[PDB]
Write a protein that binds this ligand. Sequence first.
Ligand SMILES: *[C@@H]1O[C@H](CO)[C@@H](O)[C@H](O)[C@H]1NC(C)=O
Ligand SMILES: *[C@@H]1O[C@H](CO)[C@@H](O)[C@H](O)[C@@H]1O
Ligand SMILES: [Ca+2]
Lengths: 61, 331, 445, 146
Amino acid sequence: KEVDLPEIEADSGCPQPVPPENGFIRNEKQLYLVGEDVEISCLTGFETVGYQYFRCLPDGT
Amino acid sequence: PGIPYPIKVQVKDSLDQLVGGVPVTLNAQTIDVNQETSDLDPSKSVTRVDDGVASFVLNLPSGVTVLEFNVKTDAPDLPEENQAREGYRAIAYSSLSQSYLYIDWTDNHKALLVGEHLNIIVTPKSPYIDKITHYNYLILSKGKIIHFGTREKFSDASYQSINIPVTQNMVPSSRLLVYYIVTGEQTAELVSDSVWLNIEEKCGNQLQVHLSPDADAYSPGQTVSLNMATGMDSWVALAAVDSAVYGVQRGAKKPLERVFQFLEKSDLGCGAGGGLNNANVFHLAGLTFLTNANADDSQENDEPCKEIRSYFPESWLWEVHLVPRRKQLQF
Amino acid sequence: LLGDFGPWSDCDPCIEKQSKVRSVLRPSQFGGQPCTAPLVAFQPCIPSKLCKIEEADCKNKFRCDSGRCIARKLECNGENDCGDNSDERDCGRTKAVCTRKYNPIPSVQLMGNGFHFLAGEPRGEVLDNSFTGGICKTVKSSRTSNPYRVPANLENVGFEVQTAEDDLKTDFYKDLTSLQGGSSFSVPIFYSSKRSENINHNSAFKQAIQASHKKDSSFIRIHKVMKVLNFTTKAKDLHLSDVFLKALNHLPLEYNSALYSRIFDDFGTHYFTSGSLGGVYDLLYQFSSEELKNSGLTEEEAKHCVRIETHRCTTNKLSEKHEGSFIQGAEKSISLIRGGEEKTFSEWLESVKENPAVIDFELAPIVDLVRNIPCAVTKRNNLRKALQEYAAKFDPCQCAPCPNNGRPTLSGTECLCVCQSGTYGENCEKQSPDYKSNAVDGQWG
Amino acid sequence: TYVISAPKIFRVGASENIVIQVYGYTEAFDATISIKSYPDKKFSYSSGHVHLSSENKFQNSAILTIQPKQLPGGQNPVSYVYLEVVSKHFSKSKRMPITYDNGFLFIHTDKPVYTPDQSVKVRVYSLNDDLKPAKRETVLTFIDPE
Ligand SMILES: *[C@@H]1O[C@H](CO)[C@@H](O)[C@H](O)[C@H]1NC(C)=O
Ligand SMILES: *[C@@H]1O[C@H](CO)[C@@H](O)[C@H](O)[C@@H]1O
Ligand SMILES: [Ca+2]
């Protein structure tokens, strides 16, 4: 974990998102690309209810 | 050194637009190679609306290392408190043989035409020997070398003018470098220079489309003919768009409007030209030489240069047709 | 028997040549027209590169024509060097920094360079202390001058000449040569280990041991030391020589015994940490052991007789000639001196101030200086494996046993077979009337 | 003297003109220029051949091209390649970089703005390094405003 920061916002991309309660996001990354969608799953034990995905907007959210 | 140094400045307004009729002046301090310095006499001129660029020329003492020029703006309304001031610096050509080279003219027209033979004045200031074997020049464009020239040098004058015929291959833009070789008692050292060559945009095969009926306005639904005309066999791609599409919004630029300018990006080198010793001028022109005389440092890979039903909707007439010589279609 | 010829690879451009090297097997011992026939043969090639120092990154700039890159902002003042000839650029045109005109140390090059442990010579330039570092530091000395500017590479330096002998008078360290630590830890080498001495000195003795022929040859030694300077090198970060780094920059990334072996040959096995510079008066004398019995036996005594300049002890030790002839004063004397009318010793004493030398030196491995280069870690380890195989060539083994407990040595391609006192002539062919041939002590092997 | 000039960066799948000039002599010698791989030792991409004469005034140029003969996988491949020149009086070599950017692509849409439930006419104009049409396969991807 070097301080850096690795983040270049001139490249326009999202940071690692915060999962719902009981977390567990798969394929963990430090910086996500715009238009990329990451699936979220639940820890042992639960079941994902509803549409489960997070898509990176053009803006950082 | 010994050659008058051209300085051409341009003033832009708040948003990316040139201004004219605006007087500007500069202050410079010429320093001597050994030490100390000298203050150069200031020069004032205005930017012409027609040209768009202000022109300055500074002649310096032969013992100058580098020069610094501070450009400031001058207007009767302009206060000294709120004004525009930009300082700049230029480093001299470095040669252990003390010999230099320079070229003139080149696009002041503005730009250039096709088929016309153009002459360029060159000077070999501070030579080791006034007698030079032969003059060699390489004209390049589109990131490639189009032609290889050769010339002879005579004592008839201090500055010789070389004539370069322009070709169809150079249409968007071009660069020309002129190098002359000398033979020293130990090792040989060649000197060169390069300048950007701008030229009129002209297609290899001229394409002209014109409607067969000639009228200011056409009645709706009128059967009309369209005529394609080309120099050589060519495929045409037509698009007929309404003028009302743009429209939304902010002018919506143009369908293309920039092609040769986008085709001009093929150039490997950056800037107009010139550089330290022989190497830097070549690499800035987009080339790397291989010779016995001078060594070429590549400065690694790094290139800092960046900017340096119906009736009736849109759109219709989306087609691709082969056009041998002249071809016509009716609709 | 020498060895098979090596193939040619990786052209020189800096040297603009193609070279190969041959290994040597079974070095000459008793005679038989030794190896000769130069090991490395050079051939003309076609240069691929421009012979420049290459460097990774250098985002912080500002690069030099040599390519040292000089991380901090040196430009343009004061010294504007970064390689020969001052590489310009740097300068010009803007003055100034580090004013007041400080004078450099007469010889900074000897504190630089490097030392070959096995050969005993300052082979080639490594340190190159000429680098200023942008910091202006100077030390003042007795008799000189004016101040003297301190190189960045040296951590500390001072002129410690004090208390007129005294020191050189308490010197000469009377010793008669005959038949941590520890001494066994000096065999693998690998720096200090407190390498400060631990034995020394530079070996020109190849002529002395060869002169042990036909005689019993008992030796005696006296030495004086005058330290004009005491220097210490900063071990954290060092600015390498343009020459050394150039040959270091261009090396095969794969391990090559031949090529890497040329590094130690050219630049030396070690570099100096701490240590002092100056000059020394060293002289070795040879006397026949038959003479000590005829002239009377004085062991601890007559060792004091060596002092002399400036009938028992009265006239002896290098006959005048006639005045000492009856008391002998034979035979041969050699010059072990290092560094540098009326008072000839004072003539070279002032000369050692003009042209000094490294006297008492402490060293560190050359492998420690390979830090911060392209593929640094890779070349470090490969250089460690190179020295291990390199030291093997010099360490005497195949020299074969010498009769009468003789210890074999190694000088170039010849063993020379140094024999103990009481042995007649070189190669241990004959024995003295002292009649002890029994010993024959063992060694590896 | 033998000054050989080339582009700073070679272009993969392109025609790169290499020019050579000589100091001149009473003797007319032939020359050869080629582009050899970093495995020098052992391979050759292409070989140009020229002839020198008083008619040519001791200067000539032959075009050199690099076909996609590069090794599969290990993307990005090659980078870089070696350039050589073999002549009677001189022989010299230099390493030069390569680029996989070749030619030009112009996308032309029938309209700048479209309404929902409407087709978008699209055509692309492909060109070589020589500006010739350069018949090549092309992929066209569409991206949401998101
Ligand atoms: C002489 O030099 C050593 C370095 O070799 C140094 O560190 C020590 O302080 C010196 N002696 C004195 C008396 O200062
Ligand atoms: C055994 O080992 C080393 C070198 O081999 C020394 O202890 C001595 O020379 C002996 O031969
Ligand atoms: Ca400096």
